Design a protein around this ligand. Sequence first.
Ligand SMILES: Nc1ncnc2c1ncn2[C@@H]1O[C@H](CSCC[C@H](N)C(=O)O)[C@@H](O)[C@H]1O
Ligand SMILES: [Mg+2]
Lengths: 205, 241
Amino acid sequence: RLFPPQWICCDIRYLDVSILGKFAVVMADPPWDIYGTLTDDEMRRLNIPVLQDDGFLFLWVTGRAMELGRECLNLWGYERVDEIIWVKTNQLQRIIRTRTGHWLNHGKEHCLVGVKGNPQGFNQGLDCDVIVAEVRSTSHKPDEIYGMIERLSPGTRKIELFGRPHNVQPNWITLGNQLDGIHLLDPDVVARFKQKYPDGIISKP
Amino acid sequence: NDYCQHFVDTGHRPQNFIRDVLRELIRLKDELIAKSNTPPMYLQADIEAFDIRELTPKFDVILLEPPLEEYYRKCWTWDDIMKLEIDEIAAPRSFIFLWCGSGEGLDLGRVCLRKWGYRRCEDICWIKTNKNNPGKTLDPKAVFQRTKEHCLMGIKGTDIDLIITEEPEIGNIEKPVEIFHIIEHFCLGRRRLHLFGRDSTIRPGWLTVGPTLTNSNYNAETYASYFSAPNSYLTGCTEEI
Ligand SMILES: Nc1ncnc2c1ncn2[C@@H]1O[C@H](CSCC[C@H](N)C(=O)O)[C@@H](O)[C@H]1O
Ligand SMILES: [Mg+2]
């Protein structure tokens, strides 16, 4: 095992993620173009490929990002092997019904699961692919997903992209532009960060 | 409480704990659908060897339920499915509902929709509870136990997305009848085709076509006569003229 939460406030377009090393799991909840958003090209160009050799990607999608996210996942070198749905509930366990141009109410959000390489020793098949969890503030994804990921891959290092302060977790490094400064504790990451960013400034390259 | 941890501990799926899963308005609309429905029409056909273009006129709605091997474990592969010429029988403004399973079909069904000229506009999930038989279900690629199936809705031309029922008994490949309720309540048009339907799915307002039908009554000319003027553009949710 257990390493405390770590994070980097950054513009994820500009950070050289190669300094962070390799991760068993990547999770992202991108600000799809459907504060601020990323354009479809900015999403495609994210250097996700450097983050893992063998392991899993969890990618939240809605609307047209069901298709754009599939494209991104494939472009980044993953194959989609599962798809989690979060059934959104209130405090009494009833479905919350929510978009113009749709003639169906939506009761869920989707999280694509991609695989890269051939992961070994993950506990596949412990959890199922439906999360039932209460909705909290706008865009706040359920904490259940961290538990499912920890049971799948206990004690390994993980990275979350586009996380907010409430997303930081033990064994995770969180990146996002709403985080408070830079909190790094892994000596290897600390050393490579200092070498790359001696004055702590992660500006547009 | 964490229903994921509870499933790991007990085998009860999280969806088992969803609760409660206008009336006059819904009933009147059901009634208008029933009144505007064509008589059920059906045709036994080996869809592998059948010239699909023999099904006329062009359809407003197509429900496509190819028998995937994953439903069981002739089975249809995505290679077979993708090669169906659906665009040849769909109206220029029309809708498709494709049962895609829980595996590679979630990607390949999307390729099919776009191949046939549709844009994917809803992803309807059939979430299966195990209230009667708590426990574990795996596919080799699978990361998680698969407890749901997806029906993709496509649109071409210019209710909630969840169905929750108990998991069917082994060997029962039927999809929830609720999918028909969702489709009919959209009021998309009266020319409705169900490909790979069975005797058990035959329904007023639908033409059902599939290999296992025991009987047929389809005649193209009779079928077309249901939609001749003044009834050509009816939505299926209004008083017929
Ligand atoms: N260029 C950029 N770099 C880093 N973060 C960005 C960004 N553009 C937008 N963001 C952030 O991306 C996030 C998308 S919403 C993330 C929700 C989060 N998973 C949760 O559970 O709460 C927002 O916090 C937004 O501030
Ligand atoms: Mg809860």
